[PDB]
Amino acid sequence: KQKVFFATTPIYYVNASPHIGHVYSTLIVDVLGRYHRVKGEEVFVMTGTDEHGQKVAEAAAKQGVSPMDFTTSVSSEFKQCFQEMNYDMNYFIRTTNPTHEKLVQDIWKKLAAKGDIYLGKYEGWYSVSDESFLTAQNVADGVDRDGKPCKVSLESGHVVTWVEEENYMFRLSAFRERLLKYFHDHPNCIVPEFRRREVIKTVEKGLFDLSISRKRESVMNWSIPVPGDERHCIYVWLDALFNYYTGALTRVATDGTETLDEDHHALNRWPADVHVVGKDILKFHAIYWPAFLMSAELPLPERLVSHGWWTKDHKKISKSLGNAFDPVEKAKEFGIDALKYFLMRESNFQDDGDYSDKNMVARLNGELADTLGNLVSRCVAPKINVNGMWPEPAEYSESDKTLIASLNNLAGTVDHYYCLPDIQHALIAIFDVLRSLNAYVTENAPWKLVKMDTARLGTVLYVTMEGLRICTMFLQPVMPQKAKEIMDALGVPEAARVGMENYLFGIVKPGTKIAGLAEGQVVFQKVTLP
Numbered sequence: 001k002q003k004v005f006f007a008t009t010p011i012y013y014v015n016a017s018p019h020i021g022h023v024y025s026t027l028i029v030d031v032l033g034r035y036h037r038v039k040g041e042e043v044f045v046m047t048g049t050d051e052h053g054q055k056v057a058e059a060a061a062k063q064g065v066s067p068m069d070f071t072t073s074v075s076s077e078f079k080q081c082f083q084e085m086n087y088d089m090n091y092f093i094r095t096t097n098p099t100h101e102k103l104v105q106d107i108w109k110k111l112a113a114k115g116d117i118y119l120g121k122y123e124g125w126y127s128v129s130d131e132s133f134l135t136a137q138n139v140a141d142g143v144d145r146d147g148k149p150c151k152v153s154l155e156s157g158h159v160v161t162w163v164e165e166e167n168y169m170f171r172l173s174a175f176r177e178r179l180l181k182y183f184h185d186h187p188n189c190i191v192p193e194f195r196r197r198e199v200i201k202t203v204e205k206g207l208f209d210l211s212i213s214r215k216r217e218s219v220m221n222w223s224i225p226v227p228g229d230e231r232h233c234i235y236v237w238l239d240a241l242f243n244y245y246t247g248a249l250t251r252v253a254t255d256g257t258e259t260l261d262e263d264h265h266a267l268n269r270w271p272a273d274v275h276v277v278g279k280d281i282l283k284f285h286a287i288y289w290p291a292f293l294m295s296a297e298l299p300l301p302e303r304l305v306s307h308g309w310w311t312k313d314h315k316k317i318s319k320s321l322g323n324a325f326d327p328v329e330k331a332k333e334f335g336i337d338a339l340k341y342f343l344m345r346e347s348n349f350q351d352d353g354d355y356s357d358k359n360m361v362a363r364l365n366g367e368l369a370d371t372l373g374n375l376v377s378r379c380v381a382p383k384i385n386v387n388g389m390w391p392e393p394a395e396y397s398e399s400d401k402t403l404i405a406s407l408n409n410l411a412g413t414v415d416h417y418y419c420l421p422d423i424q425h426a427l428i429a430i431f432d433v434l435r436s437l438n439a440y441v442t443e444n445a446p447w448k449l450v451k452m453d454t455a456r457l458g459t460v461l462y463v464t465m466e467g468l469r470i471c472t473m474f475l476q477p478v479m480p481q482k483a484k485e486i487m488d489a490l491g492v493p494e495a496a497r498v499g500m501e502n503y504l505f506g507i508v509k510p511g512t513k514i515a516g517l518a519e520g521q522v523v524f525q526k527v528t529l530p
């Protein structure tokens with residue numbers, strides 16, 4: 001029996017409201033989850049909120065709100081945001097969950113029993129905003145928001161602070177050779193490749209050990225206690241990273257109460273097929289996480305996808321900078337599925353780029369309306385599809401066969417890209433075929449064939465409708481609502497919208513009735529900017 005397809009988003013710090021960055025990483029995971037459901041597999045995808053630590057506690061304090069009231073309120077903003085974006089998540093975790101906290105304590109004890117924890121002292125730089133320890137070569141003299149010179153993080157630009165503190169330490173230095181061997185033996189363990197190489201270069205340079213506790217006072221008593229030593233709290237990142245494992249073990253009851261299995265095998269999710277993260281948290285997921293998993297004797301992730309940043313004026317859209325627009329209001333201004341298409345199509349995982357209304361509308365107008373939407377209207381037009389059904393095809397021409405060949409070859413290309421994963425190129429391939437379907441429809445001028453050559457019109461519509469079906473099927477993960485509207489317009493049976501048996505030309509039975517579209521009605525309304 002196949003493993004359940006398991007993918008995760010980062011768990012987001014609840015220091016402020018969700019923005020387009022969290023909607024983006026959560027979308028990637030939702031798309032992958034949805035494609036594997038469409039393919040016919042068992043799927044479990046999760047997201048959630050990272051609620052402990054100094055960064056969050058200080059955010060709460062700033063609002064004059066208890067951290068539990070604050071984390072609950074702000075966590076709810078993430079849950080509601082994702083519901084508004086019509087994601088199909090299986091599980092939404094909070095690190096304040098009693099099941100998770102106990103799990104993290106059990107993991108602590110496993111790492112201790114292994115001999116990988118000792119008591120020591122951290123004396124060095126810390127970035128509170130990133131909850132990150134920084135070595136001497138990862139800080140630079142800079143300036144803060146008030147013009148006062150200071151040290152800053154070379155990771156994030158944030159102000160760093162000097163910490164001298166008794167901390168429990170994890171023996172990360174001891175995993176150097178084991179990490180290097182994993183990276184080299186699993187050449188697609190981290191994507192894109194240049195980030196894999198960055199991780200290798202870093203690990204080859206040498207690792208220091210890592211502080212995995214803080215004194216409880218330093219985190220304002222808002223972290224999981226170290227089991228057996230309540231003077232210390234567990235480092236927010238050790239707690240947070242193991243959310244994925246808690247997720248792998250979680251059963252959700254009828255009344256929403258959650259329980260953990262004692263190990264991962266029965267639920268059959270672990271390890272993740274894909275962890276999706278921003279490059280901001282690469283070291284945590286590519287260096288610390290596999291080392292923790294090695295200590296704990298758990299299987300390592302198949303693949304880490306670490307992507308770039310959506311920017312504004314070339315600066316990362318960031319909760320800590322306040323340069324974020326409301327992502328749901330944006331989705332509602334321009335269309336939810338149109339936004340989803342734009343995020344997935346405009347971006348590759350290597351590059352940063354500014355969110356642009358102009359670029360988003362250009363794709364909505366030029367691809368979604370002018371290609372996909374146009375194609376749907378053509379296939380269902382009462383004056384073209386006179387009988388409002390899938391016609392029987394007659395003999396195929398060489399031109400027909402060439403198009404049909406592209407249809408049959410699409411699934412291979414799209415399935416391969418969805419599994420890399422490379423969602424941008426999946427969409428480019430789907431739209432390549434959609435542009436051909438439209439050029440095919442124009443070349444065959446079906447409005448002229450009507451009541452003139454019924455046989456031929458039958459072949460042209462059948463081929464086009466099948467092509468439209470196949471392309472739409474593979475767009476269901478990115479635009480699930482519009483894809484369903486299209487499938488419904490065509491009268492495509494529910495059983496024919498999903499399953500690998502439907503990955504080839506010639507599925508729908510001629511005679512099948514289409515629902516069609518109403519008079520002035522379009523799938524994608526075009527937008528003009530001021």
Ligand SMILES: CSCC[C@H](N)C(=O)OP(=O)(O)OC[C@H]1O[C@@H](n2cnc3c(N)ncnc32)[C@H](O)[C@@H]1O
Nearest residue numbers: 010011012013021025050240241277278309310317
């Ligand atoms: C066990 S995981 C713990 C994670 C930790 N709690 C944390 O880092 O949480 P966080 O609230 O700072 O969210 C950071 C994440 O949100 C996305 N993201 C944020 N801004 C983005 C942007 N401008 N563009 C693209 N993606 C962005 C991207 O996925 C980035 O890695």
Ligand SMILES: [Mg+2]
Nearest residue numbers: 013129130280
């Ligand atoms: Mg961040």
Ligand SMILES: [Zn+2]
Nearest residue numbers: 096222223224
């Ligand atoms: Zn707690």
